[PDB]
Symmetry: D2
């Protein structure tokens, strides 16, 4: 088999940042990525614009420079590839880590391709692989998506969006521009404070001109092949519907996390993996986490801007264990 | 059942142009589309730029205006949606025509959703849905694609492209820019004259700088999961390979075309469906074809520029039969 | 000379709009344009993005379509040309109108290139060409601009913006992106309500991060070649400064409008030419106005979305006079 | 009055690169730029796309990364600003060097604002500031430009282009798309070999479809207020004309170069300042040149790709002369 000093599961922005900082402290590292690098960003909608400025998304001391104020999807894809190029990062792409076991101060990593042995382990798997479950009658129909890519095919179609945060509002804007009849169904009372303040004005003007239907205090009770039923303050309504976008968020792969021996503790910000807030080391010795995997479900506490700093913290703790 | 005067199978540019012109002659028409309108363009590579100027792609008195010299994908998607909006065209989306049978002087169309009765039938299904068969050992592996979408996931991967016309060179440029190691194997002797003269210089420069491996007179003999074997002037060569893009063209759904009763004619123009060159009517009475489906093999005779004129021709012939 | 039935002064969106609807009613027209068509849009900042949708700017039987939600400066340029191409409009470019005198029931039009005599006249000259005067010492210095174009050359320069409307806010964001040290000096108390609610948060965040200096209740008192002096509730402050953008708004060429015999107003909500509202005809018979030149009395503003609809109202009034 | 070790006249790509490389060897440098940094690039047409790839334009180890194949004008502006930011370069902008004289072991530099004294001088002023002389009757009229910016104001105007290289061909394409009536007058016999091979097809197709007038072997003899008279192999023609674009090239400020005491040596392939090819030092001790100002004799073309390496070579020569 292969023996490397450190292995990092996940080649996202926070995973890449973890390998760069470990390499800067003289630790030979290998990233194993289920797809290719920044697969999460690659899976954004094709039109997506980041909400951060491009400099705040930069890692490794490679400047992220874009004429525009905020960068789009593909611009980040080009950047992070150059980040891997510049730091000469070892990246085993299209390989899925399936099992991690610790044996006498060593890890045994079993993937889809090879078997690995390492001293240090860093899990930066994010949460985008596991979408929250809808739990309404009809939620498993093929007309229900939890991911948004493009809006053109839904031209002149009756579309319902479940959710109220940035994914829902973003998709509604793109779906309206493509000729779809968009009905957003949010359970809250007012707009979520997490919708960024420069996007909501363009959405509110559309609901004022009666181009997009917005409904508050709305919970979806039934989804059929061609209808959607939702209740507002008790009153049930049923409308024709062709597709449903369940933008209800994501959550980490807790099944994988417990199978290595990591505990879920639940605390201030919620159900999160147990880790030392000063070193990001988990309850399992020599196993660290990095990225949005440390926040839990809450998709507003940790993002790319602050998750990229975990690598520098992990690098210090690993170099310390070298007595 | 539903009874409409005319039905058009396919909502591509030539299908839309056919429906516009029939409506101009007072013919009630219905488009049945397997996906949504201009699904072909929607399935282009994401970065794709058209070879034609935007005026040449315009149909049914709706001007196609783009600040750019040549229009990109999405821009055509936005345009053709506005064409459907402007001309009030009936488009039953996500419905696939499965069976056509002639009874008396009327057609019985059976789809995935409904059954229809019409007098005139127009088949404009194109050829993009059916890729040419490779016919080499290993062609059925999941690592072999006949369609190109994006190049980022193949970053730092060993990629081989089979083909030599515009699809191959476009994919090679995008794959080279995304950091892949590209090797183009062409069975021809020199560059195909059908490569647009403003794209090829960008390709040959990278070949001269040895950034893209180009092989002429090369035929692929075997594809494994991680090698590709090809012969050059008799010499067999084997290189490591991660993915294969078989850009070997497409062909019409001849099975569906024979299942309605339309003849395939072995002509010295590239084997094409049987139709009257002056009206585009097939051997079946009141059944027409439109678009690139009339060129059969050669994907270089008919494109959007001249295929959009089929609609005007069919409308005259149908108006001659009156009603 | 030349004699045309109707002549229109100005080739902006509303000048083009009035020509189309008069032609639809069978009125032969000629557009006399100081520059070329939509000179105003051409003289936007190079980066500029409209705040309207792409179809609220569309005129006369030509759809305006863009893959983006809001079109940019260059896309409108390409569009409004194609509108002229589609409608076969007669436009005389680089020809400024200098004198209009009403003799008989006709007009004699004196331009920089020929003499014209016409029955119907439309003055659609807008306001973007005549900038409000600054009224501070040093306003005539070469370091003082009333137009923003690009931000690059002011990289690592000390810049000051006078005003607080969308013009001042847009130019500040662009100059910050280009690395300039920007100080916005506004005479008002809070943020102008006319700032687009999707633009303000970007300017707000930069100010709080101390990337852009924002001083409310600020009045500029002096401009030297290397400083700018401004008072904030009486307290004077003087800072090093390399360039100045007086984004203090604009006003129509009223001097020209009176010189033909059209009265002004200055009533409560502003100041406007006299027009019938129902025909847009002025006190001068057979003399019409169109565009943002008509704003001033109404409590609402005039953009391209509304002002473009004036050409239709004018066409009926001219068709009524036959 | 002000004393710095080294001064660089010109803040273009090659000037900026020279200051970075000198700073890498511990030399205190000051750039004096008539406008701001890369003013030459700033004065391109607003649409201009580079013919080099973005990697080849990179300097002072700051990567120039752009999603697209080739970088456009503004994108280079954004990049080079970040280069000055990243290296912290002293850039006295809007200052024009008027006089340079050698005294003792010092130079006395007189600008528009201050006076400077330095040991090492590097002149990297380029050529884009001083246009070649037209030498036909009417060349000083306001309707005659030697610089192209945008094409919209010339919509539906009669425009004549003098020249035959990329500047002329680029301007012809941009002016045609804006509705101008373009006549190109080239004193050559065939298309210039310096036109890029991926642009000539686009220009070729417009000439063959009679949308642009192309006239070889044409020399302009007179420019009037609204006509232009030109002879082709002696035969004179006169056409109506509203504006004239004299794309007849540019040349360095040789007068400024001779006024400091550097010899300009005429030869074949053009005329260049005299300098040692291994240090780029002129006949004046401690006076160097950098950038495209160095081309002329050596029979080689200079662009940003190769001009950016002068700084590293000059830095060695300045370091060899010690302190
Ligand atoms: C539309 C959209 C826009 C956004 N915009 C912004 C923005 O502007 N700014 C910002 O800061 N954040 C933004 N985000 C959030 C951003 O995507 C996350 O903060 C970020 O992706 C988290 O990075 P990560 O490295 O922690 O994990 P991820 O980015 O999710 O990547 C983890 C990687 O691990 C891989 N992986 C998963 N399971 C396995 C396994 N078993 N074996 C091997 N590999 C595995 C995945 O394929 C993936 O490549 C946006 C998100 C979305 C959806
Ligand atoms: C990358 C790329 C770039 C191209 N660039 C250009 C260019 O610049 N200029 C140009 O002129 N051409 C270009 N083409 C070619 C262009 O795609 C075709 O010429 C054009 O799409 C033909 O239109 P059509 O209406 O005849 O058929 P299509 O556009 O192929 O559409 C036929 C439609 O019928 C539908 N359909 C198929 N079977 C059924 C069924 N059984 N029931 C119902 N619906 C069905 C399909 O889903 C499809 O939507 C390009 C092609 C590619 C792949
Ligand atoms: C940065 C910026 C952004 C804007 N964004 C928007 C937006 O998103 N939406 C919107 O609706 N509006 C917008 N506007 C305002 C818009 O420019 C005006 O509403 C519009 O120009 C009015 O059109 P008009 O035809 O009435 O006048 P103009 O567009 O100004 O055109 C009048 C024409 O007359 C010519 N002319 C002037 N004087 C004379 C003379 N004496 N003789 C001959 N010709 C003359 C001028 O050169 C000009 O070509 C914006 C303005 C600015 C500065
Ligand atoms: C339309 C166009 C497209 C081009 N595309 C490309 C391309 O794709 N790739 C490529 O490699 N090249 C390209 N070029 C060429 C490129 O512009 C030059 O090769 C490059 O700018 C040379 O840089 P430089 O530093 O040598 O001098 P420059 O950058 O040209 O000029 C040096 C600076 O000195 C300043 N200066 C002048 N006189 C004084 C003075 N007295 N005091 C102080 N400062 C002064 C000037 O303002 C200028 O900014 C293109 C040129 C044009 C016109
Ligand atoms: N602008 C952008 O660039 C952009 C766009 C999309 C996403 N993102 C990023 O994407 C990440 C998260 O992706 P996301 O937006 O899909 O997730 P998210 O931010 O967690 O959104 C969750 C949404 O789903 C609702 N929801 C949660 N559980 C639900 C349940 N069981 N039933 C019904 N509704 C439920 C939430 O309700 P509550 O509001 O009551 O919690 C909220 O509306 C964040 O980091 C976010 O910033 C950014
Ligand atoms: N620039 C763009 O926007 C763009 C990009 C892609 C496609 N297109 C258009 O799409 C259409 C189809 O183009 P295409 O290139 O996909 O198809 P195509 O025109 O049929 O070209 C097929 C290519 O594959 C080769 N080939 C065919 N069968 C093969 C086999 N069995 N084994 C090996 N090689 C084989 C062909 O060889 P031969 O040369 O000997 O025939 C040719 O090089 C055309 O209209 C094209 O212009 C446009």
């Amino acid at each position: 088999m292969q023996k490397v000093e450190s292995i990092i599961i996940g080649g996202g922005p926070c995973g890449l940042s973890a390998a760069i900082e470990q390499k800067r402290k003289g630790i030979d590292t290998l990233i194993i990525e289920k797809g290719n690098v920044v697969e999460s960003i690659y899976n954004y909608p094709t039109h997506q614009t980041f909400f951060s400025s491009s400099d705040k998304l930069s890692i490794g001391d490679v400047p992220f420079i874009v004429e525009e104020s905020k960068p789009r999807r593909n611009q980040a894809l080009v950047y992070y590839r150059e980040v891997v190029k510049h730091h000469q990062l070892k990246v085993n792409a299209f390989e899925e880590v399936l099992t991690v076991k610790k044996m006498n101060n060593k890890f045994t990593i079993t993937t889809t391709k090879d078997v690995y042995e390492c001293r240090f382990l860093t899990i930066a798997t994010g949460y985008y692989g596991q979408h929250n479950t809808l739990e309404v009658e009809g939620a498993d129909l093929p007309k229900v998506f939890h991911y948004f890519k493009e809006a053109h095919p839904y031209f002149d179609q009756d579309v319902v969006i479940i959710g109220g945060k940035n994914s829902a509002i973003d998709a509604a804007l793109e779906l309206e521009k493509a000729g779809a009849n968009v009905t957003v169904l949010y359970r809250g009372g007012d707009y979520s404070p997490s919708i960024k303040p420069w996007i909501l004005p363009n959405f509110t003007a559309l609901v004022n001109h009666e181009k997009i239907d917005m409904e508050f205090n709305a919970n979806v009770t039934q989804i059929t092949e061609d209808t959607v039923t939702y209740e507002v303050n008790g009153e049930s309504k049923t409308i024709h519907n062709d597709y449903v976008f369940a933008m209800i968020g994501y959550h980490p792969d807790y099944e994988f996390l417990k199978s290595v021996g990591i505990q879920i503790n639940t605390n201030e910000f919620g159900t999160a993996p147990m880790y030392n807030k000063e070193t990001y080391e988990t309850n399992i010795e020599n196993c660290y986490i990095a990225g949005v995997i440390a926040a839990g479900n809450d998709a507003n506490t940790i993002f790319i801007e602050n998750g990229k700093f975990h690598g520098g913290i992990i690098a210090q703790s690993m170099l310390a264990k070298k007595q």
